[PDB]
Scaffold this active site. Structure first.
Site, PDB file in Angstrom:
ATOM      1  N   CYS A 109       1.096  -1.253  -0.525  1.00  0.00           N
ATOM      2  CA  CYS A 109      -0.453   0.151   0.082  1.00  0.00           C
ATOM      3  C   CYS A 109       0.813   1.388  -0.060  1.00  0.00           C
ATOM      4  O   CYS A 109       1.675   1.416   1.132  1.00  0.00           O
ATOM      5  CB  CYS A 109      -0.939   0.158   1.083  1.00  0.00           C
ATOM      6  SG  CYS A 109      -1.916   1.875   1.264  1.00  0.00           S
ATOM      7  N   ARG A 112       0.369   3.738   2.898  1.00  0.00           N
ATOM      8  CA  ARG A 112       0.058   4.528   4.524  1.00  0.00           C
ATOM      9  C   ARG A 112       0.449   5.928   4.759  1.00  0.00           C
ATOM     10  O   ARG A 112       0.466   4.936   5.938  1.00  0.00           O
ATOM     11  CB  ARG A 112       1.058   3.592   4.651  1.00  0.00           C
ATOM     12  CG  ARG A 112       0.647   1.234   4.415  1.00  0.00           C
ATOM     13  CD  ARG A 112       1.620   0.859   4.860  1.00  0.00           C
ATOM     14  NE  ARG A 112       2.388   0.214   3.291  1.00  0.00           N
ATOM     15  CZ  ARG A 112       3.841  -0.310   3.214  1.00  0.00           C
ATOM     16  NH1 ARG A 112       3.928  -0.921   4.884  1.00  0.00           N
ATOM     17  NH2 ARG A 112       4.713  -0.311   2.574  1.00  0.00           N
ATOM     18  N   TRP A 281      -8.979   6.573  -0.630  1.00  0.00           N
ATOM     19  CA  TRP A 281      -9.300   7.355  -1.521  1.00  0.00           C
ATOM     20  C   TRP A 281      -8.289   6.600  -2.589  1.00  0.00           C
ATOM     21  O   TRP A 281      -7.333   6.577  -2.016  1.00  0.00           O
ATOM     22  CB  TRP A 281      -9.199   8.372  -1.823  1.00  0.00           C
ATOM     23  CG  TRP A 281      -7.730   8.866  -0.974  1.00  0.00           C
ATOM     24  CD1 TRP A 281      -6.434   9.394  -1.603  1.00  0.00           C
ATOM     25  CD2 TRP A 281      -7.370   9.594   0.052  1.00  0.00           C
ATOM     26  NE1 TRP A 281      -5.866   9.438  -0.825  1.00  0.00           N
ATOM     27  CE2 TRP A 281      -6.513  10.043   0.800  1.00  0.00           C
ATOM     28  CE3 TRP A 281      -8.623   9.337   1.098  1.00  0.00           C
ATOM     29  CZ2 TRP A 281      -6.157  10.435   2.193  1.00  0.00           C
ATOM     30  CZ3 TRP A 281      -7.854  10.163   2.826  1.00  0.00           C
ATOM     31  CH2 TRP A 281      -7.058  10.026   2.647  1.00  0.00           C
ATOM     32  N   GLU A 286      -4.149   3.828 -10.574  1.00  0.00           N
ATOM     33  CA  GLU A 286      -5.083   2.641 -10.902  1.00  0.00           C
ATOM     34  C   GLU A 286      -6.347   2.449 -11.164  1.00  0.00           C
ATOM     35  O   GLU A 286      -7.170   1.777 -11.714  1.00  0.00           O
ATOM     36  CB  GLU A 286      -5.830   2.289  -8.989  1.00  0.00           C
ATOM     37  CG  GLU A 286      -4.702   2.878  -8.194  1.00  0.00           C
ATOM     38  CD  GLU A 286      -5.622   2.190  -6.971  1.00  0.00           C
ATOM     39  OE1 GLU A 286      -6.255   1.278  -6.008  1.00  0.00           O
ATOM     40  OE2 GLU A 286      -5.739   3.468  -5.902  1.00  0.00           O
TER      41      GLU A 286
HETATM   42  C1  HEM Z   1      -5.948   6.509   2.135  1.00  0.00           C
HETATM   43  C2  HEM Z   1      -5.827   5.661   0.084  1.00  0.00           C
HETATM   44  C3  HEM Z   1      -5.041   4.945  -0.066  1.00  0.00           C
HETATM   45  C4  HEM Z   1      -4.413   4.994  -1.111  1.00  0.00           C
HETATM   46  C5  HEM Z   1      -4.066   6.167  -2.106  1.00  0.00           C
HETATM   47  C6  HEM Z   1      -4.172   4.150  -1.184  1.00  0.00           C
HETATM   48  C7  HEM Z   1      -3.116   3.500  -2.033  1.00  0.00           C
HETATM   49  C8  HEM Z   1      -2.994   1.973  -2.852  1.00  0.00           C
HETATM   50  C9  HEM Z   1      -2.964   1.778  -3.863  1.00  0.00           C
HETATM   51  C10 HEM Z   1      -2.188   2.656  -4.967  1.00  0.00           C
HETATM   52  C11 HEM Z   1      -2.329  -0.015  -3.763  1.00  0.00           C
HETATM   53  C12 HEM Z   1      -2.164  -0.895  -4.862  1.00  0.00           C
HETATM   54  C13 HEM Z   1      -3.759  -1.165  -4.968  1.00  0.00           C
HETATM   55  C14 HEM Z   1      -3.105  -1.805  -7.101  1.00  0.00           C
HETATM   56  O1  HEM Z   1      -2.564  -1.400  -7.344  1.00  0.00           O
HETATM   57  O2  HEM Z   1      -4.130  -2.798  -7.198  1.00  0.00           O
HETATM   58  C15 HEM Z   1      -2.731  -0.336  -2.371  1.00  0.00           C
HETATM   59  C16 HEM Z   1      -3.305  -1.329  -1.843  1.00  0.00           C
HETATM   60  C17 HEM Z   1      -3.392  -2.056  -0.652  1.00  0.00           C
HETATM   61  N1  HEM Z   1      -4.059  -0.774   0.525  1.00  0.00           N
HETATM   62 FE1  HEM Z   1      -4.113   0.850   0.353  1.00  0.00          FE
HETATM   63  N2  HEM Z   1      -4.429   2.696  -0.275  1.00  0.00           N
HETATM   64  C18 HEM Z   1      -5.415   3.566   0.987  1.00  0.00           C
HETATM   65  C19 HEM Z   1      -6.030   3.071   2.192  1.00  0.00           C
HETATM   66  C20 HEM Z   1      -5.674   1.710   2.172  1.00  0.00           C
HETATM   67  C21 HEM Z   1      -6.420   2.020   3.766  1.00  0.00           C
HETATM   68  C22 HEM Z   1      -7.455   3.100   4.576  1.00  0.00           C
HETATM   69  C23 HEM Z   1      -5.389   0.911   3.653  1.00  0.00           C
HETATM   70  C24 HEM Z   1      -6.440  -0.400   5.301  1.00  0.00           C
HETATM   71  C25 HEM Z   1      -7.123  -0.013   6.121  1.00  0.00           C
HETATM   72  C26 HEM Z   1      -5.260  -0.182   2.553  1.00  0.00           C
HETATM   73  C27 HEM Z   1      -4.745  -1.679   2.319  1.00  0.00           C
HETATM   74  C28 HEM Z   1      -3.899  -1.178   1.293  1.00  0.00           C
HETATM   75  C29 HEM Z   1      -3.701  -3.292   1.084  1.00  0.00           C
HETATM   76  C30 HEM Z   1      -3.978  -4.736   2.301  1.00  0.00           C
HETATM   77  C31 HEM Z   1      -3.504  -3.200  -0.292  1.00  0.00           C
HETATM   78  C32 HEM Z   1      -2.225  -4.337  -0.709  1.00  0.00           C
HETATM   79  C33 HEM Z   1      -3.932  -5.312  -1.370  1.00  0.00           C
HETATM   80  C34 HEM Z   1      -3.989  -5.943  -1.955  1.00  0.00           C
HETATM   81  O3  HEM Z   1      -2.272  -6.784  -2.048  1.00  0.00           O
HETATM   82  O4  HEM Z   1      -4.501  -6.518  -3.331  1.00  0.00           O
HETATM   83  N3  HEM Z   1      -4.584   0.833   2.013  1.00  0.00           N
HETATM   84  N4  HEM Z   1      -2.962   0.723  -1.687  1.00  0.00           N
HETATM   85  C1  LIG Z   2      -8.054   1.049   0.456  1.00  0.00           C
HETATM   86  C2  LIG Z   2      -7.835   1.163  -0.348  1.00  0.00           C
HETATM   87  C3  LIG Z   2      -7.489   2.238  -1.630  1.00  0.00           C
HETATM   88  C4  LIG Z   2      -7.059   2.409  -2.723  1.00  0.00           C
HETATM   89  N1  LIG Z   2      -7.023   3.280  -3.498  1.00  0.00           N
HETATM   90  N2  LIG Z   2      -6.445   0.973  -3.669  1.00  0.00           N
HETATM   91  C5  LIG Z   2      -7.051  -0.349  -2.572  1.00  0.00           C
HETATM   92  C6  LIG Z   2      -6.201  -1.418  -3.646  1.00  0.00           C
HETATM   93  C7  LIG Z   2      -6.621  -2.358  -3.599  1.00  0.00           C
HETATM   94  C8  LIG Z   2      -6.149  -3.704  -4.451  1.00  0.00           C
HETATM   95  N3  LIG Z   2      -7.296  -4.365  -5.366  1.00  0.00           N
HETATM   96  C9  LIG Z   2      -7.038  -4.985  -6.268  1.00  0.00           C
HETATM   97  C10 LIG Z   2      -8.523  -5.523  -7.060  1.00  0.00           C
HETATM   98  C11 LIG Z   2      -9.021  -5.863  -5.367  1.00  0.00           C
HETATM   99  F1  LIG Z   2      -9.214  -7.178  -5.415  1.00  0.00           F
HETATM  100  F2  LIG Z   2     -10.273  -5.458  -6.001  1.00  0.00           F
HETATM  101  C12 LIG Z   2      -9.315  -5.390  -4.175  1.00  0.00           C
HETATM  102  C13 LIG Z   2      -7.733  -4.965  -3.991  1.00  0.00           C
HETATM  103  C14 LIG Z   2      -7.264  -0.080  -1.769  1.00  0.00           C
END
Ligand code: HEM
Ligand SMILES: Cc1cc(N)nc(C#CCN2CCC(F)(F)CC2)c1
Ligand code: HEM
Ligand SMILES: Cc1cc(N)nc(C#CCN2CCC(F)(F)CC2)c1
Ligand SMILES: C[C@H](O)[C@H](O)[C@H]1CNc2nc(N)[nH]c(=O)c2N1
Ligand SMILES: C[C@H](O)[C@H](O)[C@H]1CNc2nc(N)[nH]c(=O)c2N1
Ligand SMILES: [Zn+2]
Lengths: 413, 421
Positions: A109, A112, A281, A286
């Site tokens: 993520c 963070r 957000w 994405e």
């Molecule tokens: C606040 C704004 C946030 C932004 C801009 C953000 C951004 C991102 C992005 C760009 C990814 C990669 C997603 C992808 O390419 O599929 C990601 C992954 C992830 N985020 Fe964040 N995120 C945010 C908030 C959060 C929150 C609130 C949580 C949990 C409480 C979180 C937990 C995760 C997790 C677990 C992943 C890994 C998802 C996966 O492995 O499929 N994120 N985030």
């Molecule tokens: C809280 C948050 C904010 C943000 N901007 N992105 C994400 C994400 C992701 C990754 N995503 C890939 C497709 C999915 F399997 F459907 C759900 C997991 C999460």
């Protein structure tokens, strides 16, 4: 042991000691790196004590009460429940802390820097799918906040015997439907076809369009999941237009404002929260890169390049790259014009570097997954590209779990 | 090395099964608990200790390679193989080292390339011209061999991959080194104010050159002299004959103003600071060259902040909203710059591959390697191009990384460890 990571753009060097406290595998071995593997590879009483102890220990350490009277009584009280009931219940403070730290520990993520501003909705009293729906709607409304998005998580009852799991079957709370046509093509989002078919089968009457918001498919207490339509007034959507190209709005593109992952498992002190939708957000890419331009997704590159009169005859014209940037410009401009929170990948990666530096200073490191942290476009012109990162698994953690329809044994005949 | 490791492409769902990794020899730097896949240099695990190895240290590595080579040609246990062992054994018994047959040297160089998990170009790996320079004794001779490499490899723009292999390390005090990181690079100058002229990556090496008596013309694209060290001696400066240094002036197929940025790049990427390791032998001077992926120039050389950093200058000329990042002005200029690099190389008929063609080729190579070899070591962090990553096939391709020998290795810049005479 210490480990240095280096930024090759700035020559800053950080010293990771936090990695000493990881415990489950990366998937890598001493001789193979599995850093690019997407997915590499219920607890007894005895398995649960050390996990719970570790988490109670670090919660009390975080709040400068390690060894305190309240720490030792909490430890004793946890052991009692695990002896009595083979499980235990987190206090609200622990649950909030666990959920924030699972986000903090999410090596993939980039967002963070925000991890400690997380609104935790404790839904562990929930018992039915309707209840989950109400909880999820309230999540959606609060998180959307009329476009001024707020990070939030709703935590449903933890796993008990694996036969009574709460699950959101949706992968995200808001997603668009996918319909494969007889001619082979797909209408809507090809990633959601399978899940669209399950909804249709459960009784959902699809509008069969390009951006049908899917219904919630909610499973409480291991029962058959149930369909609910999110109230459309809670689904904030942004119609995509371009600041330069008047014709762009004529692609009819829109996206939802609220990214809300709902298919992951939250692990806190050995407890497993199989239904824990969380939202923040969007980073622009994405949507602009993956959702719109993956060949397996909306695949709008040829359409956009077409309307840009780009030479698509050879790859080396870079018509794809060119179309991608404009699409991503539009996504950002669209959101910002509709005052819907979004972050561009430059801003997002800059803050993550600042976050990572701060995390190394105060926490002793920051597990980070380069393959995921680096944006899917313009990689090296973002600072994270040049930042070495150590990947390791800390808990509390967000975990992948199987899709519910591969494991759910169906109740009603 | 578990039991058989699958990798899946999430765009095609093709799953490939990897057994080659069983033959992995040295640590990746990762463990069950911590992945170092984004560390530039994760391990310090060498096949042999740093200095003059003993028999029990060198021979096993030699035995391994000779075994591997004779296995490759379907002659395991044959007369020649068993003689070769005895021959290497005596040679190490007497000279503390051993010499490679021409066949073995060629086999080793191509498989070092084949094993280069960071190289997207490895579909070409067996089409490699090997120049044996193991008879070379002086920096002048090294200059001769290098000029011939450059001229052959450049081939008037129809670039050909080549490697020139100078004598192997013996005691560590008699190393041959090309002190240049590449055979052809542009100087970098520290300016009186504080900024940098030319290529900032090469400022230190440029200073050694001036400090060695190179007369810097002090431009933005000053081809650096060669600084060649033979048999441990002090390095010597040589000017590569400019007729050998093919250059491409960068222009744009639509922006007629782009030529006026006064940008050019050289045609021949020729890595010269790496170590080639074969059966425990260490070729400290092994310049190898192929041809550019456009992004190496247009994205990294031209657009890295600590490199030529031309983005804002190009963006200005494009009349871009440069107030805030969300305008994606960097992203937009980045694409135009890379169009220009590709357009310019192709206009002058100088071999270059875009990142779409290159990555697609590498997917094909991965497939080939899993077919015939049972696996292909690949470093996803390096293979995925530095722009538009996810619209290339390799972004969606899982890859296993492991260290096969023969291999190319990094080595210390010689001026960190050279005691001058
Ligand atoms: C606040 C704004 C946030 C932004 C801009 C953000 C951004 C991102 C992005 C760009 C990814 C990669 C997603 C992808 O390419 O599929 C990601 C992954 C992830 N985020 Fe964040 N995120 C945010 C908030 C959060 C929150 C609130 C949580 C949990 C409480 C979180 C937990 C995760 C997790 C677990 C992943 C890994 C998802 C996966 O492995 O499929 N994120 N985030
Ligand atoms: C809280 C948050 C904010 C943000 N901007 N992105 C994400 C994400 C992701 C990754 N995503 C890939 C497709 C999915 F399997 F459907 C759900 C997991 C999460
Ligand atoms: C023939 C055309 C070739 C192409 C298109 C190509 C492509 C590339 C690219 C884009 C990189 C990454 C460079 C960077 O971002 O710094 C790379 C790395 C590398 N290539 Fe190739 N390459 C070619 C030929 C060769 C040859 C002939 C050899 C050896 C004989 C080789 C061995 C390597 C090695 C060892 C690396 C890793 C360099 C490092 O770790 O710093 N390549 N290649
Ligand atoms: C043969 C070949 C073809 C090609 N297209 N690229 C490369 C490369 C590289 C890596 N490079 C990094 C910068 C440096 F340290 F100065 C020299 C080494 C090599
Ligand atoms: C094969 C590779 O692991 C896969 O395509 C990864 C690459 N990096 C990623 N990075 C992010 N942020 N999201 C992704 O889905 C992926 N997919
Ligand atoms: C920290 C990170 O490993 C470093 O910036 C790497 C990332 N990937 C790369 N990939 C290539 N092809 N070349 C590079 O120089 C780098 N640099
Ligand atoms: Zn790893």
């Amino acid at each position: 042991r210490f480990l240095k990571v280096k930024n090759w753009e700035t020559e800053v060097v950080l010293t990771d000691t936090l990695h000493l406290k990881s415990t489950l595998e990366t998937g890598c071995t001493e001789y193979i790196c599995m850093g690019s593997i997407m997915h590499p590879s219920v607890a007894t009483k005895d398995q649960l004590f050390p996990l719970a102890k570790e988490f109670i220990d670090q919660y009390y350490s975080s709040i400068k009460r390690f060894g305190s009277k309240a720490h030792m009584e909490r430890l004793e009280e946890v052991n009692k429940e695990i002896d009595t009931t083979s499980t235990y219940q987190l206090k609200d403070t622990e649950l909030i802390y666990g959920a924030k730290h699972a986000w903090r520990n999410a090596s993939r993520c980039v967002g963070r820097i925000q991890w400690s501003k997380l609104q935790v909705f404790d839904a562990r009293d929930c018992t039915t799918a309707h209840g989950m729906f109400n909880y999820i709607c309230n999540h959606v409304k609060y998180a959307t906040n009329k476009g001024n998005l707020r990070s939030a998580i709703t935590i449903f009852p933890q796993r008990t015997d694996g036969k009574h799991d709460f699950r959101v079957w949706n992968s995200q709370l808001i997603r668009y439907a996918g319909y494969k046509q007889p001619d082979g093509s797909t209408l809507g989002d090809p990633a959601n076809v399978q899940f669209t078919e399950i909804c249709i089968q459960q009784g959902w009457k699809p509008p069969r369009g390009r951006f049908d918001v899917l219904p919630l498919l909610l499973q409480a207490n291991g029962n058959d999941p149930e369909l609910f339509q999110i109230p459309p007034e809670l689904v904030l959507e942004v119609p995509i237009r371009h600041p330069k190209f008047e014709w762009f709005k004529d692609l009819g593109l829109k996206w939802y404002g609220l990214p809300a992952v709902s298919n992951m498992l939250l692990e806190i002190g050995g407890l497993e929260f199989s239904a824990c939708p969380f939202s923040g957000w969007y980073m622009g890419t994405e949507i602009g890169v993956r959702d719109y331009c993956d060949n397996s997704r909306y695949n709008i590159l040829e359409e956009v390049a077409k309307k840009m009169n780009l030479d698509m005859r050879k790859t080396s014209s870079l018509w794809k790259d060119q179309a991608l940037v404009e699409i991503n410009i539009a996504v950002l401009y669209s959101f910002q014009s509709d005052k819907v929170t979004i972050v561009d990948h430059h801003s997002a990666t800059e803050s993550f570097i600042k976050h990572m530096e701060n995390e190394y200073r105060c926490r002793g490191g920051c597990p980070a997954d380069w393959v995921w942290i680096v944006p899917p476009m313009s990689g090296s012109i973002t600072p994270v590209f040049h930042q070495e990162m150590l990947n390791y698994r800390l808990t509390p953690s967000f975990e992948y779990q199987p899709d519910p329809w591969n494991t759910h044994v169906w109740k009603l005949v």
